Amino acid sequence: CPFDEVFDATRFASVYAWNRKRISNCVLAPFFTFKCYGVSPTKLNDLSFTNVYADSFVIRGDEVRQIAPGQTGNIADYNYKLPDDFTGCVIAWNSNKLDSKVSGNYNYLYRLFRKSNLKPFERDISTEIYQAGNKPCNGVAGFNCYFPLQSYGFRPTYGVGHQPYRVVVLSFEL
C-alpha cells in the first residue's frame, strides 16, 4: 500500500484542516508513538479491509494524548475528534528537525475558538470572526472579536512537549 506518500510527505496539513487519503486495493521511525484501539497491532497485519483512511496533521508534543477516543482539549474539541467506538491505530513521531524555524514556523495552525465542539471526523476550515462578547463583530477583528485560528510558531529550542509532531490516524472499513 502506498504509505510512503503519507508518511514521507514534504509538508503536512494543519490540524484544523487535516488531510485524509483513501487507500484501497493494495497490500519506520527511530522513536515514536504507535498504539491501536479496538484491535491489537500484531493482528492488523492479518486482517482484510476494503478501504483504509489515513488522516495526517501536525500538533504539539503534549497534544498527542488528545488523539484518542473520549478525550478533551483544544485539539480534540475544536480540530480533530475521534468517536468513542474508534477502531484503528494512532501513529505520532517527532518532527522538530523539519517543522521548526528559529524565526518561527508558521505553516501549522489550530482552531483556538469555536461556538461548539466538533462531531467525530468533522472538519471546520472556516475563518469567521468569533464573537466573544455580547456585541456583534460584523467581520471585524478586535475586542471580544477573535480570529479563530492561531499559529503554533514552532521554534527548535522549545521543550519536547512543545515540539511539532506529525500524526497519522488509520481508520478501517470492511
Binding site: 515514536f32 508513538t33 498504539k35 491501536c36 484501539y37 484491535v39 494524548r65 484518542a68 494512532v90
Partner: peptide, 18 residues
C-alpha cells in the same frame, strides 16, 4: 493507563498516554 494496544517499540514515549 490507556485502553490502547501499543506496539512493542511505540509505548516508551510518555506523550501517547492520556
Amino acid at each position: 493507563a490507556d485502553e490502547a494496544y501499543y506496539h512493542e517499540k511505540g509505548w516508551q514515549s510518555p506523550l501517547g498516554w492520556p
